[PDB]
């Protein structure tokens, strides 16, 4: 006689035209619920599974949503003789979410692509996320490995490793990119100008070695841009940097030089003073 219920299990869904939102209604004859009555539903947005269907002994029907477009829906059920339809609920379909990992963009000089392979430490990166609600937190597995602003997106790579990124959106769906194990990690140290033997040191008893030759360095640059572009160099005009003697350079007291911030490849420093930074390679 009546529908006196209308339901929605939930309000929220992936327009991937799977991700189905079911509608549950009550058809009524005052105390008394009204079996085999035959109810015909309609949708402003979206595939239903049927456009009728018959109330069990207990007086329920039922039927299901999905949508392959975002957007609101409104699906309206009424008694199958009657005229008169009831508006249930509102619900909402939105877009798959996604990272667009495929341009992960360097903070220090806009360009977009893969993950370099080769990290600057503390270098930074802006992860962008697509689809949902639009309303984006992120987190890290492991901050240790890799942080990330919980609001921007923004990645700030720490150590070597391997972890994952995650971004959820308010209407509840969660996507995530992993951040495969980098081959070399770049750590300089700015607190003070050193010896070139005193860099080889810091270097050794950091676990790592000194650059091989400009061409590492170069190599970093080429990647990352500028060093103090990014936050943690931001006092930084200059990082110029030991690079392992060549036996020619070794034999007379000197070496050369990059600086991750100038590039700047300079040669025949004597070694033998506190002529540059001691950047370590892990």
């Given amino acids: 006689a009546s529908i ?7 309000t929220t869904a992936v327009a991937n035209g799977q991700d189905a939102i079911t509608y549950t209604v009550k058809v009524m004859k005052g105390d008394k619920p009204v079996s085999n009555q035959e109810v015909t539903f309609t949708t402003t947005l979206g595939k239903l599974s049927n456009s009728t269907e018959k109330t069990d002994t207990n007086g329920y029907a039922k039927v299901t949503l999905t949508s392959t477009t975002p957007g609101k ?6 008694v199958s003789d009657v005229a008169v339809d009831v508006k249930a609920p509102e619900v909402e379909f939105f877009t798959t979410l996604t990272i667009d990992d495929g341009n992960i963009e360097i903070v220090g ?11 600057l430490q503390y270098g930074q990166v802006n992860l962008k996320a697509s689809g949902g609600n639009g309303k984006y937190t992120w987190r890290s597995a492991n901050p240790a490995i890799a942080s990330v602003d919980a609001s921007s997106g923004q990645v700030t ?6 972890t994952t990124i995650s971004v959820i959106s308010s209407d509840n769906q969660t996507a995530t990119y992993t951040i495969a194990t980098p081959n070399s990690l770049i750590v300089p140290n700015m607190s ?42 931001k006092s930084s005009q200059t990082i110029i940097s030991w690079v392992q003697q060549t036996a020619q350079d070794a034999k007379s007291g000197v070496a050369s030089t990059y600086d991750l911030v100038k ?14 930074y001691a950047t370590c390679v892990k």
């Avoid at 006196?4 to 939930?10: G, N, Q, S, V």
């Fill in 4 to 10: 006196t219920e209308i339901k929605a299990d939930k």
């Fill in 73 to 78: 829906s409104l699906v309206s059920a009424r």
């Fill in 109 to 119: 000089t806009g360009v977009k692509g893969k993950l370099p392979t080769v990290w």
């Fill in 157 to 162: 790579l720490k150590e070597k490793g391997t």
């Fill in 192 to 233: 003070k100008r050193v010896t070139y033997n005193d860099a080889v040191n810091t270097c050794k008893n950091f676990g790592g070695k000194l650059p091989s030759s400009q061409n590492e360095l170069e190599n970093v640059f080429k990647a990352w841009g500028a060093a103090n572009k990014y936050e943690y160099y």
């Fill in 263 to 276: 590039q700047n490849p300079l040669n025949n420093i004597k070694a033998s003073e506190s002529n540059a």
